[PDB]
Amino acid sequence: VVLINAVKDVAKALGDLISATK
Amino acid sequence: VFHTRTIESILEPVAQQISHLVIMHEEGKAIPDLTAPVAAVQAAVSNLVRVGKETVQTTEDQILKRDMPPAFIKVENACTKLVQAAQMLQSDPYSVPARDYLIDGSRGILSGTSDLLLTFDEAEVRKIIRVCKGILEYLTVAEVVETMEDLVTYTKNLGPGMTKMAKMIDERQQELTHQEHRVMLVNSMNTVKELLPVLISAMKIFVTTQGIEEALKNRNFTVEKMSAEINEIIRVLQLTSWD
């Protein structure tokens, strides 16, 4: 499902951002 | 925490990091350059909003047209706060509003992606409910079956309808995280499947038949028991919390 996959990409990128903070 | 394994896999790792980040900020160094990872967030958000806007325009489901746009605004605004925090930290790695804008941006993106995922799930549940209601309505037709011709027509319709409903429930329960909800779906579905041949048998006796009042009572009893289980399935399918 494309919308669900696009949501997954957002969550994965956010996770990467938070781990980059500390 | 998240009612389906799709929502859980997608959101729980990031939802746990955000909670931790909030606890750390409350109790409590320089934050490194966040330019590259923020750009990756921006590129993902842009794709989600574009595809999302395309869905809004094409869909016939008025609930999606209503609930999806505010969630996009939520994710877009939260991303704007994240882009501001990275621009602040590039100029000042010890910046105070930047640490708040990161928390606010993270919370908002998670809030908006949660809304989107829950909206998509309510939509899938509406599809299952329509199939359940279809069966409920067909169970009400049982009482007008008077001849063997009608019984054959009724059996040919209800048989496949029940198989499709049984397959939708089996596939929905596998997807659920809370066990109490899965058990209730499986139990109710099993009773419905088990009572279906009993209904067809009760209706055969009615088509065959003082004597009529007994065959009618048993057919009406089976419809009642099957209908109560179906209405319980409709109720359990709509649960997102607690057990």
Side-chain angles (χ1 to χ4, degrees), chain B residues 14-25 28-42:
Chain B
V14 64
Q16 281 161 345
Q17 285 175 309
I18 298 163
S19 83
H20 229 278
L21 211 70
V22 170
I23 298 153
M24 296 318 103
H25 190 68
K29 205 190 183 174
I31 294 165
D33 191 9
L34 308 181
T35 296
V38 172
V41 176
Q42 288 184 278

Side-chain angles (χ1 to χ4, degrees), chain B residues 24-25 28-59 61-80 82-89:
Chain B
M24 296 318 103
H25 190 68
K29 205 190 183 174
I31 294 165
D33 191 9
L34 308 181
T35 296
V38 172
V41 176
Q42 288 184 278
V45 167
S46 175
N47 288 345
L48 168 62
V49 174
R50 174 194 22 97
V51 165
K53 275 174 184 157
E54 282 162 13
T55 299
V56 160
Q57 296 287 286
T58 68
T59 194
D61 189 334
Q62 290 294 316
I63 292 158
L64 295 174
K65 299 183 102 83
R66 182 184 55 82
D67 297 315
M68 282 172 65
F72 298 143
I73 298 155
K74 259 186 178 195
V75 178
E76 281 178 280
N77 290 354
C79 189
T80 302
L82 287 184
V83 176
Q84 277 186 267
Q87 279 158 10
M88 279 173 195
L89 290 151

Side-chain angles (χ1 to χ4, degrees), chain A residues 2-22, chain B residues 10 17-18 21 32 34 37-38 40-41 44-45 48 55 68 82 106 109 113 117 120:
Chain A
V2 277
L3 265 168
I4 285 157
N5 283 161
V7 171
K8 192 202 275 185
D9 288 357
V10 172
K12 204 85 194 177
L14 190 60
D16 289 347
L17 180 63
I18 294 153
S19 65
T21 71
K22 26 220 76 175
Chain B
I10 296 169
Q17 285 175 309
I18 298 163
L21 211 70
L34 308 181
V38 172
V41 176
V45 167
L48 168 62
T55 299
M68 282 172 65
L82 287 184
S106 303
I109 288 188
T113 55
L117 291 185
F120 308 149

